[PDB]
Amino acid sequence: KYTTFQGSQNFRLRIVLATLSGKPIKIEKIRSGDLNPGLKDYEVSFLRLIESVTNGSVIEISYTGTTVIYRPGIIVGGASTHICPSSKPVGYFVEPMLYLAPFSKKKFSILFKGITASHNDAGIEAIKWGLMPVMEKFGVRECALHTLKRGSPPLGGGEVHLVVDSLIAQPITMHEIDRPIISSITGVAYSTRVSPSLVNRMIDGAKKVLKNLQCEVNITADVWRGENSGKSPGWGITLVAQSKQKGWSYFAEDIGDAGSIPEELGEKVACQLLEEISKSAAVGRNQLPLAIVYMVIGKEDIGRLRINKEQIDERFIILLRDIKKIFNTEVFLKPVDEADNEDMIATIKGIGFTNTSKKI
Template structure:
C-alpha cells in the first residue's frame, strides 16, 4: 500500500517562525499524519532551521520513529513522516549544542509523550540541554512556575521538572530533566473565564557569573513598578539569587515574575539582562509586562495563550478561555491546529480581551 502524501504547510503563514514548526510536528507525531513544511521561519533573519529547531525535530522524530528529510541548519523545507505512534516509557535526550532554548525543546516533545493506551505505564523521561534562560523564548522559570502548573491543574497530567544546571548565552550547557507520566484518557476541556483578584506575586531575580547586586537592583525596580500599579507590597515575594559557579555555565541575569489569583490563574512577566542595559530597567520591563498582562483581565498571559492551543485542540469537548487580545503566535497556533485536526476554534474579540472557544477532537492513543 502506498504511503499517504504529506500534508503541505506554508511555514511563512502569519507569525512565520519556529512555533508553527513545533506545533505541526507534535500533531504529526500524535496523529501519524506525514507533513511537509516549506518556507520555514520565512519571517526571521536569517530564515530556515537553526540548530535548536533541528534538535527539536530530531527529538520528535526519535519519539515516533519518523522519517525526517531536510533537517539541516539553514534548511527551509522539511518532510516529517511518522512510522509509529509515540514510543513512551523511555528516556530521550536532545542537545542543540548551543544556547538554544530548552523550553522550546519541551514544547515540541511534551504533547507527544502524554498520551498512552496504558495510563499506568511508567513515565517517559527527557534530558534536555541548551539554554535555560534564552532570548525570544520562555525562560525555564516560566515553564516551571506557569506552564507546568497550568498543565497539571487543567489537563490532569502531572509532569515534573528539575533544573540540574543553568546555561546562558552564548555557551548554553544547561541541563533540565523532565518526567512525563501518561494522561488518564483524553484531556478534559478547559473552562477558564473568571480570574479573581491577585492574592500574591512571586518572582526569581537572578545573576550568574555577575554580582548579586544586579539581582537586587532588578528586584527593587520591579517591586516599585508593581506597587505603583496598585498591588499591595506585602503580597510581593521576589527571591534574589546569585548562581553558584558549579550550578551554571556562562554568565547572565534576568527576572521572572508570576502573580497567582484567587481564581487559580497564574499570570507572568519576565525580562533578560543585556549588556549595556541597566538592571533596574530589566526589573521595570518585567514588572510592566506583568502589569499589562494583569490589566486585560484574562485568565492566561500572552505566552500561555498560544501554548495552550494544541491542548485545547486535542481535548474532549468544548473549551472556553478568557485571554488578553489575541497574539500573532496564537493565531498561528490556531491555524496549524485547524490544518491538521478536526478541531474548530472561535474567538470573540474586543479591544482589551478575547474569549477563545474550541471544540476539541478528544484525542486518545
C-alpha cells in the first residue's frame, strides 16, 4: 500500500524521495490541530510544480486538506513557468528541483517568478555558489540559475531561470575522507532599489571580521538598478568559503530588514560563515541533505563522505530515517583514525538508481 508519514515536516523531501524511488506515499495529519488545518498555499503550489515536470503522477488532497496521497510518475521536465506565491521565495521551489533535474527525460528549463529572497529559504546565490557546485561534483556538469530580475520582499517581482542541461544516469560515487582546505573567501553583496552605499557598507562589516584570516577576501558588489530591480527595496550579503583544491564551498547568507544597519549584517553573515566552517568537515550543514540523497541514489557501491559531530543534529537524524522508510538504505557511520578532530565517515551504499526516463 502507501508508505505513511506524519505532519508537514520534510514535505518537499518526502515528495522528492517518492519521485526518485517511484514508491507511492501518504502524508497525513498535516497541521491537524491548527486553527487553519491542512496544507499551506505554497505547499499546494509546490505539488503543482511537481506535476508540471512529471507525467502520470496522481496527487489527491483530502477534503479537509490534512492528508495527501502521492503516486509518482516518471520525471519528464521540459520548458515551463511557475508563479511562486508571496508566502515563499523562488528558492523554496528551485531547491527541490535540483534533486530531480539531472534525471529527467527532457531538459529542465523552468522560469520562476516571485520573491527572490527570504530569511529562511535558500537564496539565489546560495543555490548558484553553494548547492550547484555540489551537484557538479556528483557529475551534473551543466547546471545554471540565471537571474533575470531580482525581487525583494514584500512585493517581490523577480524572475530567475533554472537550466540543467546535463542529463545523467545517476550520480557518481563520492569518495571524500579528508577535511578540505579553504583557499579563499568570496561572496556577493547585492541591493535593489536603494543607494549603492549600502552594498559597500555590508562589505566593510564582513571585511572587519574576516581580515584576521590569512586568505584572500574578495566580495563582489552586485548593485541592481533599473527595471530589473523588482518592486521593493532590499539588500543582502552571501559569503562563500572556497576550496579550489577539490572545488568545495562553505557559505552563509542573510538579507537585511527595514531599520537594520548594513554594517551589522555584514558582520553577522561573516561571523556565521566562520561558525559554519567550524561545524563542517566535508560539506555545510545546509549542503548536507543534497549530498546524502545523491549518494543514496548512486550506483550500487560504497561511497564515503566525511562529517563532523556538529552536523549530526535533529535535522540530520530525521533525514536519515525518512530515507530508510523510502529507500531502505542505512547510513553507516565510523570514527576517523585521527585524534586532532572528532569527525566520522558516513558510508552509504547506492541503490543502483538509473535514469530510465531518458530515451536512448
